[PDB]
Amino acid sequence: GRRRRSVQWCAVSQPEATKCFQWQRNMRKVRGPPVSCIKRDSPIQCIQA
């Protein structure tokens, strides 16, 4: 209970952060067919950083 328990991004409604397995060859910046969406930055690439 630091400040806000709920923000205004994906973290609000994301009970599954492991689904990242198959989407589209070019989801965010993935090269060929789906591979990895977490191998781009340190923080989540959701609504905000």
Side-chain angles (χ1 to χ4, degrees):
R2 286 183 171 172
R3 185 179 302 158
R4 297 181 297 158
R5 180 65 186 210
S6 300
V7 219
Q8 51 184 330
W9 53 358
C10 86
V12 181
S13 180
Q14 189 181 90
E16 50 180 273
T18 309
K19 173 257 292 180
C20 184
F21 104 94
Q22 212 106 331
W23 348 276
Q24 56 179 211
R25 75 293 161 105
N26 228 267
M27 175 185 175
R28 213 297 298 196
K29 232 67 180 61
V30 281
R31 305 293 74 192
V35 160
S36 299
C37 70
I38 321 91
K39 294 178 176 57
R40 22 82 257 205
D41 287 276
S42 297
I44 71 294
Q45 41 57 89
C46 288
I47 311 302
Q48 296 184 330

